[PDB]
Amino acid sequence: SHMKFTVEREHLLKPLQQVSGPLGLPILGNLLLQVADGTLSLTGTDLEMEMVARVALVQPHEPGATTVPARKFFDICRGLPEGAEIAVQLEGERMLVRSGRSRFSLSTLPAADFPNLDDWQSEVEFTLPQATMKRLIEATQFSMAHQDVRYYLNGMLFETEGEELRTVATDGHRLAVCSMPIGQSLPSHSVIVPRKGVIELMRMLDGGDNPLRVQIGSNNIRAHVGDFIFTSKLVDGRFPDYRRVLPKNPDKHLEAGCDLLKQAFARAAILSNEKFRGVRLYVSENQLKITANNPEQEEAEEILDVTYSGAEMEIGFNVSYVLDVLNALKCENVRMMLTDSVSSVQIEDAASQSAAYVVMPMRL
């Protein structure tokens, strides 16, 4: 009932920044602080997900719990000098923060009022490097839908198969798929992580050598990184099957430099229609021609030297979808695998098949 602790500022700053992620209702604007047997626990939630940080307490402390405004508490700690010792204690309904001759009295809400996610059971468990999880999310995140009526598209599929972890994201117009080996045999499982949960998980990965431990339940996912524990509810519904979305036999193969292709599309985009973003591609022997026009009759034309020996064809695309893919492919060369004017295109790194991108054309 009389919570009290003293911690160095530098052991409090990163945990405060992290747990504040789900934030952006009163109690929802607060962090739950809990002192128990050598541990200070800090929790932030938005009801769909929660972020927890554990800080070891090496100085005398008294057990207890309270909730305090997240932004004000973080700004106070951040604003104190490097190396400051922060003494915190509950005094009635107020939380006191003292360091040097600086005194702050913050308002509180009862710890008993802080919302918790329901108790659940882990079905799947595996550990992987942080960098692998970052690569998986970064390779596909841009392809997620935002606010689509098909709820299951406003998120990302997390799929375990064999020894691989795979991410799939799609909005019904374009799709991104990436898979990585994680050196351990896994059961076959697929879950949809909500888009805000994907963003929170990304932000918790510093790319450091602290490994990431994942636990998957029927209705939840949980990620443990160092002293942090992230938990999110999952999205319901039948996610599309990338195996059926990948073009069956894309016989027309084009190869070109990733940067040269990206820069040509980015310049052509300037004179594309602001609403429809349509660009027209003309493939001929060792040549790609990109054209864009807008309602003012302004026009952009780019001619590129490429590797191409197939039949001549014309195909239209939303240039933002093409640029998104090229921006995600941080490689030297790109391969574009075409079928016809009315069929999707598959785009990938010419040197790696770990990620694949599928874009549906436009009827120009």
């Binding site: 799609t170 117009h173 059926r244 939303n318 874009v359 009827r363």
Partner: peptide
């Protein structure tokens, strides 16, 4: 824009 699925 054509639908992918």
């Amino acid at each position: 824009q054509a639908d992918l699925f």
